[PDB]
Write a protein that binds this ligand. Structure first.
Ligand SMILES: CC(=O)N[C@@H]1[C@@H](O)[C@H](O[C@@H]2O[C@H](CO)[C@H](O)[C@H](O[C@H]3O[C@H](CO)[C@H](O)[C@H](O)[C@H]3NC(C)=O)[C@H]2O[C@@H]2O[C@@H](C)[C@@H](O)[C@@H](O)[C@@H]2O)[C@@H](CO)O[C@H]1O
Ligand SMILES: CC(=O)N[C@@H]1[C@@H](O)[C@H](O[C@@H]2O[C@H](CO)[C@H](O)[C@H](O[C@H]3O[C@H](CO)[C@H](O)[C@H](O)[C@H]3NC(C)=O)[C@H]2O[C@@H]2O[C@@H](C)[C@@H](O)[C@@H](O)[C@@H]2O)[C@@H](CO)O[C@H]1O
Lengths: 292, 285
């Protein structure tokens, strides 16, 4: 099988961290910044890593059964289809959100509905946040019971003076959590390409969430199950009307994309209607032409 | 030609933001539907309001403006580019769950403070004019400016009534055409998802990833129908035969008293061959 990437323009691609559409590419202000996102992670051969699910509609979702303690309430987590979550070789159930170090606000419904079926579960990333072992605590102004299924609606700071940094991941343990490994900028002047989406972040530097692979790229790799035939895949980002090559990018086997950004610029200066196309297999050391 | 190499339970609904729970046929197997989302030809032509991504499904974006009785939205496309009242029934991705109230959770696309969410309560009555590019709402919050959001739940238009999610809206005073069962014992296959419906699952005719697959591929149609096998991914056994039509829907011949609702929900659809219109399917379920 021959490796391809989706024939879909950037703006029709979904974020792999939050339920939203991609609106631009960028590079990090610190081009040496290392990330360890647990969603949007998939090898070129189609191996899912971390908590990464297959579908865009599994991204940043939570399902579980409500339980009561002396102190309050929690969810005993299940997979999103309701099957049992077993602590094995994943940080959390598939699709579980990976926006670290902040409060989450998750809108859920009970899976004969009457009145208002929604509950907003407010979740702190403090001590009883133990998704790896299979439970989290929440508070809610509503009264959720039983089998609740929902989606991350918005995020806010853990404490009043603080901010939300969407570039961080949670601490899944309460303990080895089987995390997808860190991603380093791989040298040769290359910077990791991040795909950004608008998302309601309260007290963030911006209201945007980065990811390292568009969700449709993930499912494409899973479907295709293609053999890696080189150290990197050279891609062109192409204008779909003129077929002009707008810039060179490298797609690495571990499942992320790089470019060489022009000083003070980068892929954030490119049109957002282009399509990535596989060009050829290249050596790890292939030197890219600068973009932006 | 290929269809997505992905088990059914990892496929998304194309009419609501939810995962596929199961397949079924309609109780009345001659029932005609006209869904506006989840519609795409085999060659990759989007129809109705159907978008490419599962994260565009059943979403609304617009600018808040003042109406006679309160507030409304002047619609835009989901990416914030202007909506033109033209050939589509509405902005791409606009919900198509007809004849009911909608409850849509939105945020202001901006710096945020406090509670950034508004729930827009939308009735499909006189001012509901999505083709022209406007709808009205009531809300217990105070949304302003550029609001982007997703359908959260639905309820009855009036007290005592029931929600029928098999209906589509009236878009106002290029609708995707109806899907007719083709005859010969074949029944349209509907893909069902759990979704919060007060006083009622939501059906669709193509899982969303089938749509992006067709768009992505731009495959030539080389026969009158595509014969698909539904395969157990763990034993690799063929669990049943289905036909995929060029206009973009799927059929089976359901066994009497049964049907694809009796099949496991973790199987994978696989293209087998091109067949003629009247290729007779082995019954399933
Ligand atoms: C118990 C006590 O000493 N104080 C409680 C208040 O903190 C609760 O109201 C708080 O109002 C704050 C703003 O005026 C703030 O909204 C706070 O939580 C909110 O902000 C924090 C960070 O500062 C987080 O971002 C939260 O996610 C966010 N919650 C929202 C926006 O809904 C409010 O209290 C929060 O929720 C309570 C239950 C506790 O978990 C606090 O730690 C949270 O901060 C309110 C309690 O309901 O009044 C007092 O009880
Ligand atoms: C008493 C007062 O001061 N004002 C009255 C309003 O409260 C009434 O609003 C209705 O409140 C109901 C709850 O008691 C209910 O929420 C109703 O809508 C709900 O039920 C309808 C079907 O009957 C739909 O299913 C709605 O989706 C559902 N809404 C939910 C669950 O949130 C309310 O009426 C709706 O909202 C009002 C403002 C109007 O827009 C109606 O057309 C809507 O149906 C109000 C009802 O007419 O009467 C006031 O006097």
């Amino acid at each position: 099988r021959q490796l391809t990437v989706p024939n879909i323009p950037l703006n029709n691609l979904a974020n792999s961290r939050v339920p939203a559409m991609i609106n631009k590419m960028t590079v990090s202000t610190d081009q040496n910044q290392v990330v360890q996102f647990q969603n949007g992670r998939c090898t070129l051969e189609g191996q899912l890593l971390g908590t990464t699910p297959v579908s865009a509609s599994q991204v940043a979702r939570i399902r579980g059964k409500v339980f009561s303690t002396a102190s309050g309430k929690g969810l005993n987590l299940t997979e999103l289809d309701g099957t049992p979550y077993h602590a094995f070789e994943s940080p959390a159930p598939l699709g579980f959100p990976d926006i670290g170090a902040c409060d989450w606000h998750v809108s859920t419904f009970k899976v004969n509905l009457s009145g208002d079926p929604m509950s907003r579960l407010d979740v702190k990333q403090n001590a009883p946040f133990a998704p790896h072992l299979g439970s989290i605590e929440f508070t809610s102004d509503q009264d959720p019971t039983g089998d609740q299924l929902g989606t991350l609606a918005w995020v806010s700071p853990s404490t009043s003076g603080a901010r939300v940094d969407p570039w961080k991941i949670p601490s899944y343990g309460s303990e080895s959590t089987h995390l997808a490994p860190p991603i380093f900028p791989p040298g040769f002047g290359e910077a990791i390409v991040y795909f950004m989406s608008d998302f309601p972040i309260v007290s963030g530097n911006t209201a945007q969430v980065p990811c390292t692979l568009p969700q449709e790229f993930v499912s494409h790799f899973v479907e295709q199950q293609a053999p890696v035939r080189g150290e990197a895949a050279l891609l062109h980002y192409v204008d779909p009307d003129t077929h002009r090559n707008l810039g060179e990018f490298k797609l690495y086997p571990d499942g992320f994309i790089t470019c060489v950004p022009n000083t003070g610029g980068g892929p954030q200066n490119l049109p957002t209607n282009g399509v990535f196309v596989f060009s050829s297999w290249v050596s790890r050391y292939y030197q890219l032409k600068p973009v932006g």
